[PDB]
Amino acid sequence: EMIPTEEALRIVFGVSKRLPPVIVSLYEALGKVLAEDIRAPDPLPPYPASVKDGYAVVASDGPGEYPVITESRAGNDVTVTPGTVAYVTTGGPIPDGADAVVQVEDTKVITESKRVKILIQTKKGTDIRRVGCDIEKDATVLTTGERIGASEIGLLATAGVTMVKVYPMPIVAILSTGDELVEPTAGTLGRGQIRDSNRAMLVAAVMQQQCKVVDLGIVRDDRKELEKVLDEAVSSGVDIILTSGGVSMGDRDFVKPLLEEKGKVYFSKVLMKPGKPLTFAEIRAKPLGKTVLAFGLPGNPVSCLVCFNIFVVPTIRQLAGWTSPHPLRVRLRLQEPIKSDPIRPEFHRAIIKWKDNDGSGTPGFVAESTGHQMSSRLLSMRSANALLELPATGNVLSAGSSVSAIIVSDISAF
Amino acid sequence: EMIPTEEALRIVFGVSKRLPPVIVSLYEALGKVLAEDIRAPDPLPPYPASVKDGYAVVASDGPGEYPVITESRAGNDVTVTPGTVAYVTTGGPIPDGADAVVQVEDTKVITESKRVKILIQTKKGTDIRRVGCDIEKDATVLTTGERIGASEIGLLATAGVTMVKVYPMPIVAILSTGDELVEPTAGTLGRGQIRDSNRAMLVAAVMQQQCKVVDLGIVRDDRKELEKVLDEAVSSGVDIILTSGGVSMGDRDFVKPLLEEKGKVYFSKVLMKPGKPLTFAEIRAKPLGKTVLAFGLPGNPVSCLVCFNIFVVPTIRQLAGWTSPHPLRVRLRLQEPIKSDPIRPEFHRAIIKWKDNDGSGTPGFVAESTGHQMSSRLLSMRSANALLELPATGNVLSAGSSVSAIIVSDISAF
Ligand SMILES: [Mg+2]
Ligand SMILES: [Mg+2]
Known part of the structure; x- marks a missing residue:
């Protein structure tokens, strides 16, 4: 009754559906997937900007000595005629009449009004970003399906988008079942007790996936309390329930019977090493109606993490809108x-x-x-x-x- | 006066010193570097635990029909004699007298007191974790220098460590300088204005490095306010100052003069493409005395991120205690x-x-x-x-x- 792993996640990829999009703030959009197309409202640069520190010149005048008409540092909004130059810094608006910009280490200094000597001759358009040189107006700079990194944040800021439409991360509930489990804060262990290591492991594993964790705690091996915790979970608004333990061949393992009772189980045994038991159920919330996915992860520690990395991580990426949820x-x-x-x-x-x-x-x-x-x-x-x-x-x-x-x-x- | 990139970060790797360790909570230890050796206080398992669901048997008795003396599910703390078997689930303590555990699908059922038939013969020690099978007592399970992932969290929980000694992340201050910069919330741009994209980029870039960001905002091109922001930064407790812009050849670029005035600059021009300007200074706080590292990143957007990824990321990892801070x-x-x-x-x-x-x-x-x-x-x-x-x-x-x-x-x- 074991399902191959390729077919196992083929089921999960067929049952899991991408989450509805949400509006978030710019920093809240880090790591999330873009759910809209971003267009620049103005070009970059919106004005002719000097690439290098130096002087805006006329390409025709060539080398020689010239007076500095006005100054145009990055900040302010006079023209230049053949025979006069204007002092500009990087980012500064280029005045009317200038064809190119010469560097400053390609010029000489030369106490009343100042004059500056140009040592080289420049071709037209040298060291000048034309309007929209890097980003043209109304162009798509970020497209739907793109994952927002640091540079995509910089592009959103360039375009003025501080409220972004993205696919959110799934909320994940995590719990352990075991009559031998105690909290990790426990000092000296009693007879037959072990500390609960799967819960803190899964919590951190989900934290690395940038998902909201809801810690349902340790649950004993009994059908009533294990049902109460499950009914608490799906009704709280969670998207994924992560169960550790209680899914084996013992006679107090109530995860499989309770999952198939509240929803539809798709498999319970997988041709895997490790992790022969792996229950995946689909539960439906009964309120805004929504569908909840449940992973009955095996109780063995290395078996729990392995099933998380192979079956939960892609499920998380698919709910978050990834096009390639599969791992590298x-x-x-x-x-x-x-x-x-x-x-x-x-x-x-x-x-x-x-x-x-x-x-x-x-x-x-x-x-x-x-x-x-x-x-x-x-x-x-x-x-x-x-x-x-x-x-x-x-x-x-x-x-x-x-x-x-x-x-x-x-x-x-x- | 350009320094090769190999020598450039050779200076940074020589000036940057690892941060003092801090005690954090278990979840706060995710991603951070371990600054102490972890030893298990008790073994795992601390008791003989059954690996499979079934019955604890005597290897000598072999197959046949046997009565079920007691039951030993995972949870409780009677012996078994040659001729009797005990019912156990996975995780359950093995009673005295048992040599091995047979699976449950290798047994038969067989209304008063119950009897169970064993279909196979097992070698001694089959499907049994001896005391300390996986983790022995007082053994080092996590060593100094290890990066805490999800599994290392699970090991900390197993050992009962919920307060961990780790190297912290550096606090990072970020600011932009430019008289043409406006906030990204600005709608219609005026003459000579562009939105500030480097700041939000660096903020997110540092957020991905799990460091605390302190947003010092836009600063104009003037020595007085740029000094006030710098003096605010180093006195606030920050470990790294990230400056964007104001480090070129213009006559209003006060980052280099103010860095060399308040500390010791190590280089200002790097043989790089892109990012010819790149100022790295060492500043000293004057209170508990501490040394602050300052990166005068270039103002060009792609140039800013590139210098961040090549010179700031390793500096962050080295302050956080990485042994291999260099990128892959x-x-x-x-x-x-x-x-x-x-x-x-x-x-x-x-x-x-x-x-x-x-x-x-x-x-x-x-x-x-x-x-x-x-x-x-x-x-x-x-x-x-x-x-x-x-x-x-x-x-x-x-x-x-x-x-x-x-x-x-x-x-x-x-
Ligand atoms: Mg169990
Ligand atoms: Mg500038």
């Missing part, structure tokens, strides 16, 4: 021998480093293994930035064979 | 013909996409040019995630030659 996939060569599982494809976590020499004798990517891949050993996720997509061959891949990998974190490194 | 550098092949400047090396911005086939017939990176590289055309920074490091050869590199590139944004893409 790269081909790399192995740095050490590693065996694969024969039954299900193993998402082996590795540390990816770019090298100016590998894959053969060319520059490419390499990846060393993090160690043991136990579903409970969270030390395998430590400093892991890649996810090796290993086939279910059961063989041993040599320290040089090429495989496929998913980028789950920014490499940076050296 | 990758070798890629060109997708189109492009000419280089003969005098200074040009940092040409490109759109980098990973392809399963290029550089030859192998998988690698490719990069297409963004278009015109004018220092004032901010449309060249649009959707640019890479920075081509072009040599000062002045030749034309064919649509297939390999060059060096700096990753300034997460590729993602397809």
